[PDB]
């Protein structure tokens, strides 16, 4: 009986195994746009992905992860609210059963169809496992997906999903360029938070871009054909793998833009 996104093991149950679920800096949150305050001291984000080395795509039973070589400073996030250098380790998405839900963050209570998370770790802690034990260990870049025009840079991801349908399947996924998943603007909101899955560690500086990317209905329909289950188990579609908004508590969301 492990955690997941069902009635019996979903987000409302996670606190029993992971009491930090009821902590002071949990993610995601609702971004109240009128309340977020413009912080003119925030720097432009620096997204340096031209030397990114993708390696593999994995169905881990909760999402699919596109994994990168993080054994050197190739693909790094710097600037914005961050001190120092954060290496890209993986990206994944959260998505819904329907276009009207799927995102983890919300904007004035609006849910997007999906949300992309590019996960980076602070190189001053040496490895990812040490970084998640630190309050400034990770930086996650969150990007909303809305359904409209196709995202050309997503199609190579969509087309490999047939090969990792079930939990524990992986496939080689080299030479994928994550710059193809970014919107035009790097305007963002930022706040201190957590991992949005168990173990729910409070180690994340969240950077959520204001501008969504557009994906096609066909692209997100292919996400929804993935399975939570392993091969040879009853089929459980991988949909609604999102944690809902958590209480903001004693936090301020800052905007990089007016
Ligand atoms: C390199 C080996 C390693 C591996 C995982 C962990 C602890 C768990 O860490 C994590 C577990 C889940 C996630 C994904 C979370 S956080 C987010 O933004 N969205 C998710 O789904 C991110 C980190 N420690 C060490
Ligand atoms: Zn995530």
From Swiss-Prot:
The keyword Transcription does not apply. The keyword ATP-binding does not apply. Its main location: cytoplasm. The modification Phosphoserine is found at residues 163, 170. Activated by X-ray, histamine, L-adrenaline, L- and D-phenylalanine, L- and D-histidine, L-His-OMe and beta-Ala-His (carnosine). The record marks 5, 60, 65 as: Fine-tunes the proton-transfer properties of H-64. It catalyses: hydrogencarbonate + H(+) = CO2 + H2O; urea = cyanamide + H2O. Changing residue 104 to A/Q: Strongly reduced CO(2) hydrase activity. Its EC number is 4.2.1.1, 4.2.1.69. Changing residue 117 to D/N/Q: Reduced activity. Changing residue 92 to Y: In OPTB3; partial loss of activity. Residues 1-257 form the Alpha-carbonic anhydrase domain. This is Carbonic anhydrase 2. The gene is CA2.
């Amino acid at each position: 009986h492990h955690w997941g996104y069902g009635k019996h093991n979903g987000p409302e149950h996670w606190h029993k195994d992971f009491p930090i679920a009821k902590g002071e800096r949990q993610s995601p949150v609702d971004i109240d746009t009128h309340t977020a305050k413009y912080d003119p001291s925030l720097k432009p984000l620096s997204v340096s992905y031209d030397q990114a080395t993708s390696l593999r795509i994995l169905n881990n039973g909760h999402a699919f992860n596109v994994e990168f070589d993080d054994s050197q400073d190739k693909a790094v996030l710097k600037g914005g609210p961050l001190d120092g250098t954060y290496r890209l380790i993986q990206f994944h998405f959260h998505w819904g059963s329907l276009d009207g839900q799927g995102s983890e963050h919300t904007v004035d209570k609006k849910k997007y169809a999906a949300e992309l998370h590019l996960v980076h770790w602070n190189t001053k802690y040496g490895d990812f496992g040490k970084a998640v034990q630190q309050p400034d260990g990770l930086a996650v870049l969150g990007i909303f997906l809305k359904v409209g025009s196709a995202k050309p840079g997503l199609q190579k991801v969509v087309d490999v999903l047939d090969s990792i349908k079930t939990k524990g399947k992986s496939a080689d996924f080299t030479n994928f360029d994550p710059r193809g998943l970014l919107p035009e603007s790097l305007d963002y909101w930022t706040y201190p938070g957590s991992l949005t899955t168990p173990p729910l560690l409070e180690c994340v500086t969240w950077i959520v871009l204001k501008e969504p990317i557009s994906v096609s209905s066909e692209q997100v329909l292919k996400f929804r054909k993935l399975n939570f289950n392993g091969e040879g188990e009853p089929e459980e579609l991988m949909v609604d793998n999102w944690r809902p908004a958590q209480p903001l508590k004693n936090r301020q969301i800052k905007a990089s833009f007016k």
